[PDB]
Swiss-Prot record:
<dbReference type="GO" id="GO:0004134">
    <property type="term" value="F:4-alpha-glucanotransferase activity"/>
</dbReference>
<keyword id="KW-0963">Cytoplasm</keyword>
<protein>
    <recommendedName>
        <fullName>4-alpha-glucanotransferase</fullName>
        <ecNumber>2.4.1.25</ecNumber>
    </recommendedName>
</protein>
<keyword id="KW-0119">Carbohydrate metabolism</keyword>
<dbReference type="Pfam" id="PF02446">
    <property type="entry name" value="Glyco_hydro_77"/>
</dbReference>
<keyword id="KW-0328">Glycosyltransferase</keyword>
<dbReference type="InterPro" id="IPR003385">
    <property type="entry name" value="Glyco_hydro_77"/>
</dbReference>
<dbReference type="GO" id="GO:0005737">
    <property type="term" value="C:cytoplasm"/>
</dbReference>
<comment type="similarity">
    <text>Belongs to the disproportionating enzyme family.</text>
</comment>
<keyword id="KW-0808">Transferase</keyword>
<dbReference type="GO" id="GO:0005975">
    <property type="term" value="P:carbohydrate metabolic process"/>
</dbReference>
<dbReference type="InterPro" id="IPR017853">
    <property type="entry name" value="Glycoside_hydrolase_SF"/>
</dbReference>
Length: 500
């Protein structure tokens, strides 16, 4: 496609500076959008914005279409006499999903009740409208959550069979009993998409394109799976017959067992890939470009026997990527998908990605563990520039925290390379800008860099650490940490490297 040479930033809403312990679709986002713009930024990259259960990871969401309530801006509701906002005393620059979970949610069921009372037939109708429009996915979700909650936060595939196997009466009577809890989660979803819809235009106004992200494999315990057991490899108990993951390597002798459920592509294909089409449909509604973690999963996927604790007994299975994207392109005329093809990827994948002109990924933090042959090296990127360069993604340590743990060879081989590209640094705190700058000088059309580096923060500011049992997705931004200085400094490069 056509991704005009430019630079963007990676800042998940949660990391937005804001009162009450978390980032929200509030104006501070608009401030950032103003910052981005000022700094000459044309793109903004965020992680999946779906609801999050334990772990608080945006990739193991309860819904493939639902938005994360946490990211909702509460004050605009308190500004209409809906809910009185307290504050158990949230920490600075770090999300406390424990606190937030126990506070937000309650403070939410409050705003809702504060709505049905003081709400206006303009807000009552608007909300109702959102309900008729987003029916297909919403109904299932609101019921999924309402039930999930009613059943002591238990996975759907453990609820009484009548409900698990989604029976008529069960689903009717349950809905009737929680008619209010259903109206609630919907009300949450409404507020979310509503504010994000505006936040979108705020970005569309400030000449900005937002980049969304979505995991190829859904989450086992999610509305979608529950609602549609037919599409996933699941036994009559709901539990996945097989799970997702990757094969063993020089790193993981055992491999990886993500546990995610696998798609019955045979069925999806028969149904015209209605799940994805519907899925990308929502995507294009929220963002201008959306990425798909683990892209190779479209060419072929590693099938792991649920019963196995590891990924050893796995096997490769071919998936209809060629067909899927033919449908996507015929439905949208375009295929605005950012391919997440890091890690080892076979040519059949490369062919697919390239057959639809899908931009790939390029992370610098990996470009120095070997020789100049390193694919993550600027001089090894494709000419078409249809690739995106990241100093380091969300699943990576901050570049600073990286340079502080990188092997000696890398640290040196780097400065040795940065020089070859007219780039040189002194302090280590400057290294984040070194590679950043380097990323721009590349042929790469887009150069999205995470806010953690723009500020040059240590490992402490690391977003997610694959393997670590917590503290992930916890990092946030402090008031004014993103000063004009930083902006003008980035804009400098943007112009200097003709990205503006």
């Amino acid at each position: 496609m056509e991704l005009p040479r430019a630079f963007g930033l990676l800042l998940h809403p949660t990391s937005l500076p804001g009162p009450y312990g978390v980032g929200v679709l509030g104006q501070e986002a608009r401030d950032f959008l103003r910052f981005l713009k000022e700094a000459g930024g044309r793109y903004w990259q965020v992680l999946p914005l779906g609801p999050t259960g334990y772990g608080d990871s945006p990739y193991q969401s309860f819904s493939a279409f639902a938005g994360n309530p946490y990211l909702i801006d509460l004050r605009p509701l308190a500004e209409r006499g809906y809910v009185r906002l307290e504050d158990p005393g949230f920490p600075q620059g770090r999300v406390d999903y424990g606190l937030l979970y126990a506070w937000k949610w309650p403070a939410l069921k409050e705003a809702f009740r504060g709505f049905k009372e003081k709400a206006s037939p303009e807000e009552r109708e608007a909300f109702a409208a959102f309900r008729e429009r987003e029916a297909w996915w919403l109904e299932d979700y609101a019921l999924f959550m309402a039930l999930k909650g009613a059943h002591g936060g238990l996975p759907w595939n453990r609820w009484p069979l009548p409900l698990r196997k989604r029976e008529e009466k069960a689903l009717r009577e349950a809905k009737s009993a929680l008619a209010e809890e259903v109206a609630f989660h919907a009300f949450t979803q409404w507020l979310f998409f509503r504010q994000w819809g505006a936040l979108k235009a705020e970005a569309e106004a400030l000449g900005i394109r937002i980049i969304g992200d979505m995991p190829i494999f859904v989450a086992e315990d999610s509305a979608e799976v529950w609602a549609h057991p037919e599409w996933f490899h699941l036994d009559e108990e709901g539990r996945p017959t097989v799970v997702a993951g990757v094969p063993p390597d020089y790193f993981s002798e055992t491999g990886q067992r993500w546990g995610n459920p696998l798609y019955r592509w045979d069925v999806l294909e028969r149904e015209g890939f209605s799940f994805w089409i519907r899925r990308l449909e929502k995507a294009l509604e929220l963002f201008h470009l959306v990425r798909i973690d683990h892209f190779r999963g479209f060419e072929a996927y590693w099938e792991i026997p649920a019963s196995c604790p590891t990924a050893v007994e796995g096997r490769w299975v071919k998936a209809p990527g060629e067909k899927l994207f033919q449908k996507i392109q015929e439905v949208f005329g375009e295929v605005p998908v950012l391919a997440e093809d890091l890690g080892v990827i076979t040519p059949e994948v490369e062919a697919l990605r390239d057959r639809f002109g899908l931009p790939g990924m390029k992370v610098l933090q990996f470009a120095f563990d070997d020789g100049m042959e390193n694919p993550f090296l600027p001089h090894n990127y494709p000419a078409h520039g249809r690739v995106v360069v990241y100093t380091g993604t969300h699943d990576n340590d901050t570049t600073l925290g990286w340079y502080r743990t990188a092997t000696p060879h890398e640290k040196a081989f780097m400065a040795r390379y940065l020089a070859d590209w007219g780039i040189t640094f002194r302090e280590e705190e400057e290294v984040p800008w070194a590679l950043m700058h380097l990323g721009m000088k590349s042929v790469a059309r887009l150069a999205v860099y995470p806010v953690q580096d723009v500020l040059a923060l240590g490992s402490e500011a690391r977003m997610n650490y694959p393997g670590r049992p917590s503290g992930n997705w916890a990092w946030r931004l402090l008031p004014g940490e993103l000063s004009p200085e930083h902006g003008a400094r980035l804009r400098a490069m943007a112009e200097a490297t003709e990205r503006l």
